[PDB]
Structure formats: structure tokens, C-alpha cells
Design a binder for this molecule. Structure first.
Ligand SMILES: CC1(C)C[C@@H](Nc2cccc(-c3sc(C(=O)O)c(OCC(=O)O)c3Cl)c2)CCN1S(=O)(=O)Cc1cccc(NC(=O)CN2CCC(c3ccc4c(c3)oc(=O)n4[C@@H]3CCC(=O)NC3=O)CC2)c1
Ligand code: NA
Length: 279
């Protein structure tokens, strides 16, 4: 017998109402202060003028004269899973990015974009593609590529993150989804879910390590799609009955504009329906 979400999907797909449902979510989303993002000193720390962390959820860089990074802590209590969503780092904010990864005790970075997409640069090359050490002098960190695992539609890089100021080093799993087009969707729910399950298997979404860092270019479209599916499946695994629109609206209180297109919203539902079948 069809589930509630399955029946919802069927009616939206047969009446072609994804586009109206998406606009309803934009209309029902709540705006919050995001004033720090607008300080003149933070102008060069934002990739997109219209995409800003909220002041009540932004990740703060500790012990820094300027604590600002365009990154949001998304903390759904019912899920007992918190994530950081951030933009693709700029050349001048790669140093802040790794500082945040260190301070947050992050174990996994999930990167959903390619560096160059639709004839523009979406993200700085913030990790070594070769054996040379990548140095971030502004915050005192160095990154080395230890190993790579190239799969058919994604690559996992094992990165060694060195805090030069404390001597300590940590291994970071860098999960690079290389087949997710900008403003588009993954090739299939199955391939998306296989990737999500591999991120989960690394234990890097558990409450024992720090929050995983998810990013694309703006940190809201593909990153929001990936987060909505992961959060809804986590809530479904706990046995609580969810409404996808309400979960997305709740997640939008932590970071504005999660899910950029009706097709992305549609894909979320599809992946959640397929994920529920595994559960
Ligand atoms: C963030 C943005 C800006 C991002 C933009 N996209 C975008 C931009 C830039 C780059 C990119 C890129 S570039 C890129 C790449 O790769 O290149 C990417 O990546 C791609 C990939 O990855 O695929 C991406 Cl992505 C994309 C899309 C849009 N949003 S947005 O939608 O979120 C904005 C937003 C934010 C927050 C919230 C809301 N919505 C509301 O506020 C609705 N309001 C709610 C209250 C309601 C009310 C008001 C008074 C009322 C009332 C109800 O009730 C009452 O009583 N009252 C009063 C009370 C007082 C009184 O006395 N009487 C009354 O009646 C009205 C409606 C909207
Ligand atoms: Na599938």
C-alpha cells in the first residue's frame, strides 16, 4: 500500500505542482537577522551577496579578530544530527574554512560541486591535487593529500590537516560528488543514497565527531538537497512520522534558501521515498 509521501509524490507529479509547492516553501520561509554577513569588513568573505548565514546560527571562528565565515550550523534536535552548511571557499577564505574544520572537530567534508561549472569558478582549490603540501599561513594550517578512492561518480580524498600552531594533525575524509550538475540533480536516487550511506559509514555524521561540513558553491542548493534527504531519513529511522515540507522549513530557520529548484525538491522526495524502502 502507498505511503503518505508516496501518495503526495504521485499527486504532485501527475498534477505538475512541484513549481507551486516550491514557491509555497519560499513564501512560508522565515527571515531572520543576518547582519554580521553585511558588515563592510565581511564583503570579501561572501561569494554571493544574496546568500548569508543567519546571526543566530552562523559558525563563529574562535579566537580570531574577525570571527565571520559564511557557514551555518544546522541543528535539528529531533534528529540528534548537526551539520555545517557553507559556501565554496574563496581564495581568501580557504584559511578560515580549514580553521573552522579544525575548531569544529569536523571529520568529513562533503563537496557537491566541481571547481568550474557553467563557465565560472565556483570554489577555490582548497585541497592539494598532488603530493605538494598546501599551506594556509593566515590561520596556520597545512593540508596534504594522503590517498584517493576514485569511484564512478564521486571520489573520496583522505586529507591530512595539520594545525601548525598546536603541532596536531587529523585525517579528514573529503567526499567529492563530481556528477551533480549545478542547479541540477544527481543521476539517480540510488547513486545519491549510495554516496550518503558512504558518508554515514565513515561515522562522520555521528554525535561523537564534530559536525560534517557540507558545501557546494552557495551552500544552499545542492547542499540543501543533500541535507534534507539525510535529515528526513534520520527522522524516519527514529520512527517519527515526518512531513518533508515542514522538515525543510525547519531547516530553513538555520540557513536561508535550502533547495534552489523545484526539480531539486522533487529529487529530495524521490530519494527519501527510495531511502524509506531501505529502512
Ligand atoms: C536565499 C535566497 C535569497 C536565495 C535565492 N537564490 C539564489 C541567490 C543567489 C545565489 C544562488 C545560487 S548561485 C549557485 C551557483 O552554483 O552558482 C547556487 O547553487 C546552486 C546549486 O547548488 O544547485 C545558488 Cl543556490 C541562488 C532564492 C531566494 N532565496 S530565499 O527564498 O531563501 C529568500 C528568503 C529568505 C527568508 C525568508 C523568505 N521568505 C519570506 O520571508 C516569505 N514571507 C514570510 C513572512 C510572511 C508574512 C509577513 C508579514 C506578516 C505575515 C506573514 O503575517 C502577519 O501577521 N504579518 C504582519 C505582521 C505585522 C502586522 O501587524 N501585520 C501583518 O500582517 C510574508 C512572506 C525568503
Ligand atoms: Na533509483
Amino acid at each position: 500500500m502507498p505511503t503518505t509521501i508516496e501518495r503526495e509524490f504521485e499527486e504532485l507529479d501527475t498534477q505538475r505542482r512541484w513549481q507551486p509547492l516550491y514557491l509555497e516553501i519560499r513564501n512560508e520561509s522565515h527571515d531572520y537577522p543576518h547582519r554580521v554577513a553585511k558588515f563592510p569588513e565581511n564583503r570579501n568573505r561572501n561569494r554571493y551577496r544574496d546568500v548569508s548565514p543567519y546571526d543566530h546560527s552562523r559558525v563563529k571562528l574562535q579566537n580570531a579578530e574577525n570571527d565571520y565565515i559564511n557557514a551555518s550550523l544546522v541543528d535539528i534536535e529531533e534528529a540528534q544530527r548537526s551539520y555545517i552548511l557553507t559556501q565554496g571557499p574563496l581564495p581568501n577564505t580557504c584559511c578560515h574554512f580549514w580553521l573552522m574544520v579544525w575548531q569544529q572537530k569536523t571529520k568529513a567534508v562533503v563537496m557537491l560541486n566541481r571547481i568550474v561549472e557553467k563557465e565560472s569558478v565556483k570554489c577555490a582549490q582548497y585541497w592539494p591535487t598532488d603530493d605538494q603540501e598546501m599551506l594556509f599561513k593566515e590561520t596556520g594550517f597545512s593540508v596534504k593529500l594522503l590517498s584517493e578512492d576514485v569511484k564512478s561518480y564521486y571520489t573520496v580524498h583522505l586529507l591530512q590537516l595539520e594545525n601548525i600552531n598546536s603541532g596536531e594533525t587529523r585525517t579528514i575524509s573529503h567526499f567529492h560528488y563530481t556528477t551533480w550538475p549545478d542547479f541540477g540533480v544527481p543521476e539517480s536516487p540510488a547513486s545519491f543514497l549510495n554516496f550518503l550511506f558512504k558518508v554515514r559509514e565513515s561515522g562522520s555524521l555521528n554525535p561523537d565527531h564534530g559536525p560534517a561540513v557540507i558545501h557546494c558553491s552557495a551552500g544552499i542548493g545542492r547542499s540543501g538537497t543533500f541535507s534534507l534527504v539525510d535529515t528526513c531519513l534520520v527522522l524516519m529511522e527514529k520512527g517519527d512520522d515526518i512531513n518533508i515540507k515542514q522538515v525543510l522549513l525547519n531547516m530553513r530557520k538555520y540557513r536561508m534558501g535550502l533547495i534552489q529548484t523545484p526539480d531539486q525538491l522533487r529529487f529530495s522526495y524521490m530519494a527519501i521515498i527510495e531511502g524509506a524502502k531501505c529502512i
